[PDB]
Each structure stands twice: as C-alpha cells, then as structure tokens.
Curated annotation (Swiss-Prot):
Keywords: Antibiotic resistance, Hydrolase, Plasmid, Signal. Not inhibited by EDTA, inhibited by clavulanic acid and tazobactam. Inhibited by cyclic boronates, including vaborbactam and bicyclic analogs of taniborbactam. Its EC number is 3.5.2.6. This is Carbapenem-hydrolyzing beta-lactamase KPC-2. The lineage of its organism: Bacteria, Pseudomonadati, Pseudomonadota, Gammaproteobacteria, Enterobacterales. It comes from Klebsiella pneumoniae.
Length: 265
C-alpha cells in the first residue's frame, strides 16, 4: 500500500503545475510513505519550528534563557511580523519570541532568535547535532524565501524534516520539560488550519509548523499527529513550482497529506 501513492501524487502535481514532496512515518510500524522525499525544497518559514527547538535545547544548559527580556526597537521589524509589531512598546521574552515565531510565523522574532543562536550556521549546527545531515539554513528572513529553482540554500528534504521533527517531539533530543514545550507550541499554531490539519480527522491532536515563501509556488507544512488511541504519525509536505509567479496552494498540501495518510493504511 505505501507504494501505490506515486500515481495519485503525480496527478496532484500535474493539477498543481509544480512539484510536491512528501514523507510520512507511522511511529507504530516504522512504515513510511515517500514521494520526492529525498529532493530539496525551500524551508521558507518552516525553519522557525526547528529554531524554537534549538532555543529550547540551549535552555537545558542555560537557566533563565526563556524568560530573558528582549527590548527590540522598531529597526528589528520587517514584514510579516504581526506579533513583534503588536508588542513593540513592551518587548518580548525569548519564550514569547519563540512562540510568535512558531505560532504566527513572526519574521522579526525569528531573526532576533537567530541572532542569539549564532545565526543560520548555528541553527544548522544544532540540526547536525541531532543527526540531520540534509538541513541547511544559509540566510535570514526575508531573503531565505527566494526559492530559486535548483538553489540548495535554505532547504531540506521532506524525509530529514520528518526525521528531525520525530527526534525533537517524540525522541530523546530534548529534555522532558523542553520536549513538552515544543509540542505545546506546535499544537497552538494558528497558521496551519488549511494544510495538514485539514487532512486529519477532527478528533486527532495535531501540532504543526507552516512555511510560505511567497514565490515559485513554494510552501509547506510539517506535523505531528496523534490518532485517538494509537502511535503518533509524523509527516512533512513541501511544494515548489517552476515560475516565480506560480501560486502556492494550501489545498494541494492538504490533499497531499490525505494521500500520505491513506498510504499508511
Ligand atoms: B516565511 O515563510 O519564511 C515568511 C513569513 N510567512 C508568510 C506566510 C504566509 O504568507 O502565509 N507564512 N509565513 N515568508 C515571507 O516573509 C515571504 C512572504 C510570503 C508571503 C508574502 S511575503
């Protein structure tokens, strides 16, 4: 059954006018569904989930990190920073910046956290530390969104995203409290209701992080899903398309997720 999804994905790609990348893993079986699971796709804002996890990992060695106040100025602001804008007058703690980045995809917040962490190379090193050899972050918000076809900057594979997400949310890469905080942040995400969440029965708990580059039909979602009374499922859906003005589609990400889940039957 896991090998009967190729033609359904191909049709979806053809309808979409671009490329879809999927990796889904049932943590009960170990069983997987792949489709372009090894190809690079741009992360767009989906790197912010892993950023927050990296912050949490630092907090295991550094008490008082998460509650540290960051009083940023208006200069820290860039587009797509709805929470950072709203809290300009008060500042935000590292934890509040992390939640804004994950749950609202806040750009300014993500860049502030990158700066704490040693930049794109520092995040990349953290992902190496958990055994992810594919992930690379090269640039900052907003230029990491360029999504130029063939460009490996600021990309990973669906497989590596899912494997890394599993380690951090369900595996041993984070301490217990930190692990739960990561899961909670992903669970309260607000930007993903039309993506993997739309593909999942209403009764199942879901945590996710989205990404939207805004060019080259490039957008994505990754998630942990808790089917009632069963082992979690972890999955990643990434898209791109050949022309700069090709439109991304949330509906295609949801349909891709439904196929992957079906494939795990
Ligand atoms: B992220 O994907 O790197 C970032 C912030 N963002 C936009 C969205 C969305 O459009 O739903 N989610 N998160 N992307 C950008 O800042 C580039 C843009 C995407 C759309 C307009 S600008």
């Amino acid at each position: 059954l896991t090998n009967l999804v190729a033609e359904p994905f191909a049709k979806l790609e053809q309808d979409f006018g671009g490329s879809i990348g999927v990796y889904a893993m049932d943590t009960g079986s170990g069983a997987t569904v792949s489709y372009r699971a090894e190809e690079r796709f741009p992360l767009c804002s989906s790197f912010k989930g892993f950023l927050a996890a990296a912050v949490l990992a630092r907090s295991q060695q550094q008490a008082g990190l998460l509650d540290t106040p960051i009083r940023y100025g208006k200069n820290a602001l860039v587009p797509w920073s709805p929470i950072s804008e709203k809290y300009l007058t008060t500042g935000m703690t590292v934890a509040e910046l992390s939640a804004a980045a994950v749950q609202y995809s806040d750009n300014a917040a993500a860049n502030l956290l990158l700066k704490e962490l040693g930049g794109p190379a520092g995040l990349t090193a953290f992902m190496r530390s958990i055994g992810d050899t594919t992930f690379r972050l090269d640039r900052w918000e907003l230029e990491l969104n360029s999504a130029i076809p063939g460009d490996a900057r600021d990309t990973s594979s669906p497989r590596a995203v899912t494997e890394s997400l599993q380690k951090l949310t369900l595996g041993s890469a984070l301490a217990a409290p930190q692990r739960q905080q990561f899961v909670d942040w992903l669970k309260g995400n607000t930007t993903g209701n039309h993506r993997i969440r739309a593909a999942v029965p209403a009764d199942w708990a879901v945590g996710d992080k989205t990404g939207t580059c805004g060019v080259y039909g490039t957008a994505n979602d990754y998630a942990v899903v808790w089917p009632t009374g069963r082992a979690p499922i972890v999955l990643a859906v990434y898209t791109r398309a050949p022309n700069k003005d090709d439109k991304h589609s949330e509906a295609v990400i949801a349909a891709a997720a439904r196929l992957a889940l079906e494939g795990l039957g």
